[PDB]
UniProtKB/Swiss-Prot annotation:
Protein name: RNA-directed RNA polymerase NS5
Lineage: Viruses, Riboviria, Orthornavirae, Kitrinoviricota, Flasuviricetes
Task of the protein: Replicates the viral (+) and (-) RNA genome, and performs the capping of genomes in the cytoplasm. Besides its role in RNA genome replication, also prevents the establishment of cellular antiviral state by blocking the interferon-alpha/beta (IFN-alpha/beta) signaling pathway. Inhibits host TYK2 and STAT2 phosphorylation, thereby preventing activation of JAK-STAT signaling pathway. May reduce immune responses by preventing the recruitment of the host PAF1 complex to interferon-responsive genes.
Location of Phosphoserine modifications: 49
Entry binding sites for S-adenosyl-L-methionine: 49, 79-80, 97-98, 124-125, 140, 212
Native species: Dengue virus type 2 (strain 16681-PDK53)
Location of this chain's protein in the cell: Host endoplasmic reticulum membrane; Host nucleus
Domain of life: Viruses
Domain mRNA cap 0-1 NS5-type MT stretches: 1-257
Membrane topology, as annotated: Peripheral membrane protein
Quaternary structure and partners: Homodimer. Interacts with host STAT2; this interaction inhibits the phosphorylation of the latter, and, when all viral proteins are present (polyprotein), targets STAT2 for degradation. Interacts with serine protease NS3. Interacts with host PAF1 complex; the interaction may prevent the recruitment of the PAF1 complex to interferon-responsive genes, and thus reduces the immune response.
Sites marked Essential for 2'-O-methyltransferase activity: 54, 174, 210
Site description mRNA cap binding, residues in chain: 7, 10-11, 13, 18, 22, 143, 205, 207
Amino acid sequence: TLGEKWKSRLNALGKSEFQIYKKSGIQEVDRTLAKEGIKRGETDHHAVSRGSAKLRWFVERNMVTPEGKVVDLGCGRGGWSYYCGGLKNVREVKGLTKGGPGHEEPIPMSTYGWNLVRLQSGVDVFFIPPEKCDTLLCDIGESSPNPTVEAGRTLRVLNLVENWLNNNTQFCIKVLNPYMPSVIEKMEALQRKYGGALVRNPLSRNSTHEMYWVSNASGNIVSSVNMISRMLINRFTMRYKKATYEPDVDLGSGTRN
Ligand SMILES: Nc1ncnc2c1ncn2[C@@H]1O[C@H](CSCC[C@H](N)C(=O)O)[C@@H](O)[C@H]1O
């Protein structure tokens, strides 16, 4: 497929060439100071990761309207959870991850609405009973040189999420590899059953073909992905181009009643 061609080409790049391509013409969050602040123990204002700004991109465009009880599957440090904790119609946020050595452990913060957020690692979302929620978030998906490996991992995530959804469910779910036939088929059925569409976030690096399945979006799946495969391929042709930066998000401080 067109995406697989992109994948072959990506795997043939040298080290230096990869790092450059990875950032060419993408959008980037200015994280220097937020990171230095967290390192000094600062728990107010800062986003634990660039995932906050990433999720904000979708939310400010109403592609996902987090509300009620939010479940963040694979929350990592908590970037997505903490951001939702400060959102108007959100009442509760539950984030889950593996954590442990060689894995991202959630960081305790005092950002706005932190008291509405509960994080816990040592949990493998794939084998715990599904819970009820109003919005389901999931940013799971480890990339690999081999697209068939990504296809399976992706299909696992899609089936995992299919269990946590009902209808009225707001959702933003990462789809690591959306171009492999197997994943495309699944997405067509899921779209057919739960709506929404796939969207490319300008903050995603060129090194990944990741797209997110957002509930409040529309668009033909096959058409979605290809449009993006062509983009990523075109970006290979770029010379001496870097990312455009933007200020990170300020998450406030304070509790919510
Ligand atoms: N089976 C599983 N169960 C729980 N967590 C998992 C998992 N597989 C992967 N993960 C976690 O999924 C996380 C995805 S990266 C998290 C980004 C987060 N949205 C943020 O903005 O900070 C990784 O940290 C990984 O540790």
